[PDB]
Design a protein around this ligand. Structure first.
Ligand SMILES: Nc1ncnc2c1ncn2[C@@H]1O[C@H](COP(=O)(O)OP(=O)(O)OP(=O)(O)O)[C@@H](O)[C@H]1O
Lengths: 54, 98
């Protein structure tokens, strides 16, 4: 569908985690759940656990 | 006469000679379609529901052809001619531009 193609990434302006004020423990817990199983995917495979889904 | 009249019957005499030149030219008809996917080539969909892969018109650069955009294609062998302004819903929300 053409609407799916418009939904793709057009680049969201660089916020950086420095411009999210406060909220330290929330940032940590999200990047644990979303970021790591993409980049550090080898450390979960050896541990045996499945990757958090959302 | 007062049959097939809808004007002041004074500027429509000259308009009569101008419409003979437009009827001979194929600025129209241009069957109105919409793009579904740009293929670095386009995937066009007609309204009578039948899809085509078309080329490019000599009128226009490929820079102006965008995703989902409404485009007019040839009556015959379908080729992209002119980009059009988007949106077909405007007919309630266009009525409230004050
Ligand atoms: N913790 C924060 N640090 C810095 N700026 C913030 C913070 N929280 C909110 N803001 C500012 O508030 C604006 C609006 O926040 P946002 O749109 O995320 O609200 P929301 O929580 O998503 O509401 P909704 O219930 O509609 O989802 C942001 O653009 C941001 O500039």
């Amino acid at each position: 569908d053409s609407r799916v193609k418009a939904m793709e990434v057009d680049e969201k302006p660089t916020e950086t985690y420095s411009d999210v004020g406060g909220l330290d423990k929330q940032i940590e817990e999200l990047v644990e759940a979303i970021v790591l199983p993409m980049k550090r995917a080898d450390k979960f495979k050896d541990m045996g656990i499945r990757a958090p889904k959302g | 006469g007062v049959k097939e009249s809808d004007t002041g019957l004074a500027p429509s005499h000259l308009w009569d000679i101008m419409g003979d030149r437009q009827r001979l030219g194929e600025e129209h008809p241009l069957q109105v379609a919409r793009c579904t996917k740009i293929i670095k080539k386009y995937v066009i969909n007609l309204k009578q529901i039948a899809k085509f892969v078309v080329g490019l018109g000599e009128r226009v650069s490929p820079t102006d052809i965008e995703e989902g955009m409404r485009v007019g294609v040839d009556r015959s062998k379908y080729n992209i001619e002119l980009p059009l302004p988007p949106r077909i819903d405007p007919s309630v929300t266009m009525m409230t531009v004050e």
